[PDB]
Amino acid sequence: GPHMQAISEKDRGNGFFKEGKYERAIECYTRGIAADGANALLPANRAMAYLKIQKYEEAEKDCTQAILLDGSYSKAFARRGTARTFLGKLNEAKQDFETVLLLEPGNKQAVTELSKIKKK
Amino acid sequence: SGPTIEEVD
C-alpha cells in the first residue's frame, strides 16, 4: 500500500543510484513523491541523483522539496548549496551551508563546501 | 560512509 510504495522506490532507486544509474533512480523516487509526498528522503535521493548528472536546476528544487517535508534535514541544505553553487547562485548556496551548521554544529561538508563559495 | 550528503537514505 501507500507506505510500502515509498520503500519500493527507496530500495529500487537506491540499487540503481549505487550502480551509477542516477538517471534510472530518478524515475524510481519520482513514483514515491507522487504516491506519498511526505517522506523527505524520496526527494533527497532524486535531488542527489540529478546532482550526479549535473542537473543542478532540477536538484535545487528537489532539495527544497525534501526540506519542505522535514525542515531539520541538514543534508538537504548542504545538497541544495552544492546545486546552487554550480547553478551560478553561489551566494544562495552559502545561505544554505550556513544553515547546515545550525543543525550539525561541526559539519565538515558545511565548512568545506561553503569555503568554495568564498574563494577566488 | 559516515554522516555525509552524497549517500542515499
CSV table of C-alpha atoms in Angstrom, one decimal:
chain,number,residue,atom,x,y,z
A,1,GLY,CA,0.0,0.0,0.0
A,2,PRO,CA,1.0,3.7,0.1
A,3,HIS,CA,3.5,3.1,2.9
A,4,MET,CA,5.3,0.1,1.2
A,5,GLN,CA,5.2,2.1,-2.1
A,6,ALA,CA,7.6,4.6,-0.5
A,7,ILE,CA,10.1,1.8,0.4
A,8,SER,CA,9.8,0.2,-3.1
A,9,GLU,CA,11.2,3.4,-4.8
A,10,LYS,CA,13.8,3.7,-2.0
A,11,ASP,CA,15.3,0.2,-2.5
A,12,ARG,CA,14.7,0.2,-6.3
A,13,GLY,CA,16.1,3.7,-6.9
A,14,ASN,CA,19.0,3.2,-4.4
A,15,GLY,CA,20.0,-0.1,-6.2
A,16,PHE,CA,20.2,2.0,-9.4
A,17,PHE,CA,22.0,5.0,-7.8
A,18,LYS,CA,24.7,2.9,-6.2
A,19,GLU,CA,25.2,1.1,-9.5
A,20,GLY,CA,25.9,4.5,-11.2
A,21,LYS,CA,22.4,4.6,-12.9
A,22,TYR,CA,21.3,8.0,-11.4
A,23,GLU,CA,19.0,8.8,-14.4
A,24,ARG,CA,17.2,5.4,-13.8
A,25,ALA,CA,17.0,6.0,-10.0
A,26,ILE,CA,15.3,9.4,-10.5
A,27,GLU,CA,12.3,7.8,-12.3
A,28,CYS,CA,12.0,5.4,-9.3
A,29,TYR,CA,11.9,8.1,-6.5
A,30,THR,CA,9.6,10.2,-8.7
A,31,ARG,CA,6.9,7.5,-8.3
A,32,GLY,CA,7.1,7.7,-4.4
A,33,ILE,CA,6.8,11.6,-4.2
A,34,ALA,CA,3.6,11.1,-6.3
A,35,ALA,CA,2.5,8.1,-4.1
A,36,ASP,CA,3.1,9.8,-0.7
A,37,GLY,CA,4.8,13.2,-0.9
A,38,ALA,CA,5.5,13.2,2.9
A,39,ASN,CA,8.9,11.4,3.2
A,40,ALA,CA,11.9,13.9,2.7
A,41,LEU,CA,14.2,11.0,1.6
A,42,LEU,CA,12.4,10.4,-1.7
A,43,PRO,CA,13.0,14.0,-3.0
A,44,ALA,CA,16.5,14.0,-1.3
A,45,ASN,CA,17.7,11.0,-3.3
A,46,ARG,CA,16.1,12.3,-6.6
A,47,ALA,CA,18.0,15.6,-5.9
A,48,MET,CA,21.3,13.7,-5.3
A,49,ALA,CA,20.8,11.7,-8.5
A,50,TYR,CA,20.1,14.9,-10.5
A,51,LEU,CA,23.3,16.4,-8.9
A,52,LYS,CA,25.3,13.3,-10.1
A,53,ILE,CA,24.2,14.1,-13.8
A,54,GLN,CA,24.9,17.9,-13.3
A,55,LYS,CA,21.1,18.8,-13.2
A,56,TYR,CA,21.5,21.5,-10.5
A,57,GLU,CA,18.4,23.3,-11.9
A,58,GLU,CA,16.3,20.2,-11.0
A,59,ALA,CA,18.3,19.3,-7.9
A,60,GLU,CA,17.8,22.8,-6.3
A,61,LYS,CA,14.0,22.1,-6.5
A,62,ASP,CA,14.2,18.6,-5.1
A,63,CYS,CA,16.5,19.6,-2.3
A,64,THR,CA,13.9,22.4,-1.4
A,65,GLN,CA,11.1,19.8,-1.6
A,66,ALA,CA,13.0,17.5,0.9
A,67,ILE,CA,13.4,20.5,3.3
A,68,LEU,CA,9.6,21.2,3.0
A,69,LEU,CA,8.7,17.6,4.2
A,70,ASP,CA,11.3,17.7,7.0
A,71,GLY,CA,12.6,21.2,8.0
A,72,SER,CA,15.5,19.7,10.0
A,73,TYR,CA,17.2,17.8,7.2
A,74,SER,CA,20.7,19.4,7.4
A,75,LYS,CA,21.9,17.2,4.4
A,76,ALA,CA,19.1,18.5,2.2
A,77,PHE,CA,20.6,22.1,2.8
A,78,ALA,CA,24.2,21.0,2.0
A,79,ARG,CA,22.9,19.2,-1.1
A,80,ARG,CA,20.9,22.4,-2.2
A,81,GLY,CA,24.1,24.5,-1.6
A,82,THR,CA,26.1,22.1,-3.9
A,83,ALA,CA,23.3,22.5,-6.6
A,84,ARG,CA,23.0,26.4,-6.3
A,85,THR,CA,26.9,26.5,-6.4
A,86,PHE,CA,27.2,25.1,-9.9
A,87,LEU,CA,23.9,26.8,-10.9
A,88,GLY,CA,25.7,30.2,-10.6
A,89,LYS,CA,23.6,31.1,-7.5
A,90,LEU,CA,26.8,30.8,-5.3
A,91,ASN,CA,25.6,33.4,-2.7
A,92,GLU,CA,22.3,31.4,-2.4
A,93,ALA,CA,24.3,28.2,-1.8
A,94,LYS,CA,26.1,30.0,1.1
A,95,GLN,CA,22.7,30.8,2.8
A,96,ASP,CA,22.1,27.0,2.7
A,97,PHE,CA,25.5,25.9,4.0
A,98,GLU,CA,25.3,28.5,6.9
A,99,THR,CA,22.1,26.6,7.9
A,100,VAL,CA,23.7,23.1,7.9
A,101,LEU,CA,26.0,24.2,10.8
A,102,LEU,CA,22.9,25.1,13.0
A,103,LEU,CA,21.6,21.5,12.6
A,104,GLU,CA,25.1,20.0,12.8
A,105,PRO,CA,27.5,22.2,15.0
A,106,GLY,CA,30.7,20.5,13.5
A,107,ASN,CA,29.7,19.5,9.9
A,108,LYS,CA,32.9,19.1,7.7
A,109,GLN,CA,30.8,19.4,4.4
A,110,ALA,CA,29.2,22.6,5.7
A,111,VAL,CA,32.6,24.1,6.4
A,112,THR,CA,34.3,22.8,3.2
A,113,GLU,CA,31.6,23.0,0.5
A,114,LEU,CA,31.0,26.6,1.9
A,115,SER,CA,34.7,27.6,1.7
A,116,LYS,CA,34.4,27.1,-2.2
A,117,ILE,CA,31.7,29.8,-2.2
A,118,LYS,CA,34.1,32.3,-0.6
A,119,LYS,CA,37.4,31.5,-2.6
A,120,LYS,CA,38.7,33.5,-5.7
B,1,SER,CA,30.2,6.3,4.7
B,2,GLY,CA,29.6,8.5,7.8
B,3,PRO,CA,27.0,11.3,8.2
B,4,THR,CA,27.7,12.5,4.6
B,5,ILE,CA,25.4,14.1,2.0
B,6,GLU,CA,26.3,12.1,-1.2
B,7,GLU,CA,24.9,8.8,0.4
B,8,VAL,CA,21.2,8.0,-0.2
B,9,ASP,CA,18.9,7.2,2.8
